[PDB]
Design a protein around this ligand. Structure first.
Ligand SMILES: Cc1[nH]c2ccccc2c1CC(=O)N[C@@H](Cc1ccccc1)C(=O)N(C)c1ccccc1
Ligand SMILES: Cc1[nH]c2ccccc2c1CC(=O)N[C@@H](Cc1ccccc1)C(=O)N(C)c1ccccc1
Ligand SMILES: Cc1[nH]c2ccccc2c1CC(=O)N[C@@H](Cc1ccccc1)C(=O)N(C)c1ccccc1
Ligand SMILES: Cc1[nH]c2ccccc2c1CC(=O)N[C@@H](Cc1ccccc1)C(=O)N(C)c1ccccc1
Ligand SMILES: Cc1[nH]c2ccccc2c1CC(=O)N[C@@H](Cc1ccccc1)C(=O)N(C)c1ccccc1
Ligand SMILES: Cc1[nH]c2ccccc2c1CC(=O)N[C@@H](Cc1ccccc1)C(=O)N(C)c1ccccc1
Ligand SMILES: [Cl-]
Lengths: 200, 201, 201, 207, 200, 200
């Protein structure tokens, strides 16, 4: 990421081994489950475009997903080039880090006024990662139906987990006959707290 | 969370990997046992509303509970909007929860003079919601905690006050077993838990 | 705990994830064995009353013991109120325990000149209470620690002074077995534990 | 790596135990899989030539690979000597690799003004050599990655671009080949999307 | 241990959780094996007498050993009182051990000019006591370390010098008949390197 | 190791718990495999002679090896005394007869007398002797198996070479009949890359 030294000039702080390993391990364990994205964002805090690429390059498997991410980056970079025509001023390929030095990236971010190439590129990466989360989502919301002997609590967990990866009235629909009858009896506009308390 | 840099202006300190992982692991291991809340508060110390959302978003399972938490946030945000009507701008409820406010704005309000502590306010709402989650996921009721025939008093008191925390001193005596109960009544009114435990040992 | 920033004002340093987890894990593994207390004190170094409560609240089980600790806190707080009658304000007992005082107030009193160390005072009460817990949960009495027939002296001395710490030098000799006891009396009065152990080896 | 002390002069910051162990463990677990290189680069950030050698020397096995790396270093060092003929002294190839230069000299060149970044140059050679190792230890060729009859497209694309990365060694016709080596059922659906289709669209189609 | 703050005055740095735990765990795993002492010294680097007591108090078992250590501290404290008779005050033996001195006083003496290093002195006494504990808890005597019939010399030498550390020509004596004959043939003044190479 | 404080004078930085534990664990896991030495050097970076002794003393087993190391230290210290007849003698460099403040003295002195780097040189020299003895197989006995890959043989070759010009030609000699014939066909001066590629 980014620091000001004792000499006054702003220079690249080396990305830490804890952070490097943290990001590698989350992707190993959680793949591209929704919670990986908030974590990516947090671990890549204050990151230069170089650092962002470092973090993505440390991911070992999942090359289909990472290739999809490349395409989303290439798309968002072209969209930037369209809205910001060269008349230095950072183009899309400079923001993604393909055609810009580290000192330039430090330049734009630490410049006054700040051109936050790191936060912009992260926005594109996250945008791409979300697309990956949505595709790799295994089950559809429609197929989450409460089992006969399944607790409501466990069904609601499965419902809103599936919902996050990919509505309040559907939760009632896909409940089992016994809970469904109790849920309809509470009437319209009932809170999840009340619904869960009822089927306990 | 929040720091003043060498340049003088107050800026966002990146939430640390230790802290991120600490919060993830407690929720993995302890789920929503009462002791998770104090820990959440402590790990989310000095947190901006963005950081609070980061921490909640890093939680993977428990989406029923997190959805209940959303509703409590939406309720407390509407209650704020009601008491603080809109006329550096004045923060509405959706700005405090972080849905409609930038990081620089959140830094703004908290580091502003006078301080409008949006982080501490939002944390209050989150904890309020988390408490509701602790209370629901509490399995047993206080009335059903009764001392077993061959159960030690020590173990019963543990089970009593554990159940009490998740969800009075005279009830502890009531639900004791016949042998200890007789010894406890003999100590008389106003006896300390120390004395009661010492007696049934 | 507590730090002075670059701006000059003293502000709350967020309690670290290492420290939080350290305290949780010691209590998980060691329960309330005597060595937990020195560790609690050390981990809670420079702690505000808020931080002390954070640390106690992160403990999950043992609610009987923690309830005893509450009573000791309530007693010591009432004793403070008695000796310091209310006439930056002057801190009452409930302000020291952190129930009726803000973080900024606690920072206030501790960093004030002259320093009113509410953190060190409250820690004194907590430790006082924790000691009572250590003393009760102590299973065996010193009088019942007697050396076995085929037990090594080394192992007996371990059991003796372990029991002594949780709850004299001449008693150690008394409760030794007939064979070692005869060798120990032969060393004569004023013998060091080193010499005594060397003798029965 | 490298730091300025309180006395003003620039001095060697001792390479950290986290970093040392991080590099040892990645090589133990991942051997010379493509992702090891980005990590080597990142862990060896701001490293002097001495530190780079420290890191390579902490690797225990793989001595065939490390011997190949030595040869690549010896080649790139000779190429440097050729382009920079000897006429604080001017650093030759053996000084950049750290065989014939002190730590204080290496600090010298890197912290000098203008900066002669011997550390970044030597890292370039090491990575160049490591890439050759990744490329050789790459088991399968891109042409032999063909989608199975009951294999998901997702899994095939993973296998495709994994193999592509190792052979090109994390460095950038191939998009059209992905369609070719797909199975008859997906291939027919993929051709129907027409030219210039994104991988997102292709994957969505064969799902 | 000990630090100078931004205000200029020297103040107590809180003993770190890594250090606390490090010391606890070594004593759990290694008990009072000889290598524990160097580690105690290293972990207790720059420690005030308070901190030294903190570290000893965090040890849970081994109360026989810790009681022996107390006696060694009480002895060395009395020896100090004898040589330094009371006439910022002058530190007596009970002040060095931390029983009758405040933290601010201990900071006082150590950071004073000239430095009265109460921490380093007390550590010397603790280590002196710990060594006595190592020596007693040493299970085997040097005389009973004899090389087995099918035991390698390497393994015997390990067992020899391990036992020696806890408590030269004898090393040759207690070797087995086959190696002993080869060792005597090398003649007097032979290095361990040469001896080990011979019986390989 | 060694630092300058806020007061200006150079003082002993306490050796870290990470570093202490790192060195203990490598020796536990890797014993005295060649890669332990580079790691020892790296972990003992900027170390005073005291710190070097601390690190060696934290090693628990292997007392035969550590005793060999003592002898190498005693030899190199006597060699120093011979060539250099306050001014640091050999026993002062090894840390047996010199205080920490003296060691800080010589290293931070101007001109710098780097007693730490000198003593490390002796330790490493001794450690190398230990690596060389504990090396199980000789280079001559590393011969390629009938169904063994060349890759695996080269690994075994250069591993054995590290523990213990003409050597490059021997690699070809001890290869199996099928690869050996392919290797000779490449002709003199062939790179290991080319040789490995050929027998694949
Ligand atoms: C965690 C989660 N589950 C979902 C299910 C369906 C759709 C989206 C989601 C999300 C992401 C999700 O919405 N996360 C929340 C943060 C959050 C997480 C957990 C509990 C409370 C607040 C968020 O990012 N923001 C901005 C937010 C904050 C307050 C109210 C509403 C939204
Ligand atoms: C831990 C616990 N058990 C309970 C049972 C019923 C209701 C609440 C609880 C709580 C939370 C609980 O009350 N925790 C205590 C802190 C505490 C915890 C453990 C021991 C001593 C002090 C607390 O937060 N405060 C402000 C407090 C402190 C001292 C006296 C009174 C209150
Ligand atoms: C990861 C990977 N797979 C490949 C296959 C063939 C050739 C090269 C590769 C690489 C390395 C690879 O291309 N890594 C990317 C970083 C990256 C990795 C993963 C997803 C998104 C961005 C990179 O270094 N840069 C400069 C980059 C940045 C944005 C767009 C395009 C390239
Ligand atoms: C650990 C322990 N065991 C005991 C048995 C009976 C009474 C008290 C205790 C204690 C607490 C205990 O006495 N701890 C010691 C520290 C200590 C621990 C272990 C060995 C040496 C010194 C202590 O805090 N102080 C001030 C002390 C220091 C030196 C001599 C006497 C007292
Ligand atoms: C480690 C060890 N084994 C022993 C066996 C018998 C008696 C004492 C010991 C010791 C303690 C021991 O002697 N440790 C050595 C350090 C050391 C450790 C390992 C190898 C080389 C040097 C030491 O502290 N000093 C001052 C020393 C340094 C060089 C030569 C001789 C002594
Ligand atoms: C690792 C190793 N295997 C060997 C086998 C026989 C003899 C020596 C060795 C060594 C030590 C070894 O030679 N290590 C290398 C560092 C190194 C390690 C691995 C790959 C590239 C560079 C080294 O220290 N230096 C100075 C060096 C640097 C570049 C080229 C040649 C030597
Ligand atoms: Cl860690």
């Amino acid at each position: 990421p980014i620091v000001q030294n004792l000499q006054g000039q702003m220079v690249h702080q080396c990305i830490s081994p804890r952070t490097l390993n943290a990001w590698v391990k989350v992707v190993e364990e959680k793949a591209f489950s929704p919670e990986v994205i908030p974590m990516f964002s947090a671990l890549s805090c204050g990151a230069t475009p170089q650092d962002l690429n470092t973090m993505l390059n440390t991911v070992g498997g999942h090359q289909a997903a990472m290739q999809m991410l490349k395409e989303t980056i290439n798309e968002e970079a072209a969209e930037w080039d369209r809205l910001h025509p060269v008349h230095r001023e950072p183009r899309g390929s400079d923001i993604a880090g393909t055609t810009s030095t580290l000192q330039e990236q430090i330049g734009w971010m630490t410049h006054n006024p700040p051109i936050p190439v790191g936060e912009i590129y992260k926005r594109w990466i996250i945008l791409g990662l979300n697309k990956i989360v949505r595709m790799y989502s295994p089950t559809s919301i429609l197929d989450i139906r409460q089992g006969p002997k399944e607790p409501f609590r466990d069904y609601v967990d499965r419902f809103y987990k599936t919902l996050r990866a990919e509505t309040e009235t559907l939760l009632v629909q896909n409940a089992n006959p016994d809970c469904k009858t109790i849920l309809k009896a509470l009437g319209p506009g009932a809170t999840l707290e009340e619904m869960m308390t009822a089927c306990q």
